Design a binder for this molecule. Structure first.
Ligand SMILES: *[C@@H]1O[C@H](CO)[C@@H](O)[C@H](O)[C@H]1NC(C)=O
Lengths: 48, 49
């Protein structure tokens, strides 16, 4: 019943591929909400 | 209703609120303030931080 979100921001100079490096992800937030999630979506910001 | 100042007991308007809780269904979010003591140092004590 806990939704855990961890996050990290990292500036990159390489163009496309993922970097050859290591960096931990510090915890961001916990939510005490009980939902039986099984699928999800994504949001985009288009130019109308 | 016929609430009037001259009315006696059993007729004067009353304001009543009933409070309801839940029993072990979701993680708690509203609870009584746990009391706190001060801090001692350099003494063999027991703590509940
Ligand atoms: C998981 O799904 C079941 C029904 O398939 C539901 O009864 C239960 O509450 C769900 N669990 C959570 C944490 O929402």
């Amino acid at each position: 019943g806990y939704f855990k979100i961890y996050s990290k921001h990292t500036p990159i100079n390489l163009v496309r591929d993922l970097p050859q490096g290591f960096s931990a992800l510090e915890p961001l937030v916990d939510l005490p909400i009980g939902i039986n999630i099984t699928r999800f979506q994504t949001l985009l910001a288009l130019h109308r | 209703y016929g609430f009037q100042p001259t009315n006696g007991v059993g007729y004067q308007p009353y304001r009543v609120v009933v409070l309801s809780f839940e029993l072990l269904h979701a993680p708690a979010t509203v609870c009584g303030p746990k009391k706190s003591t001060n801090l001692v140092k350099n003494k063999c004590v027991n703590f509940n931080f």
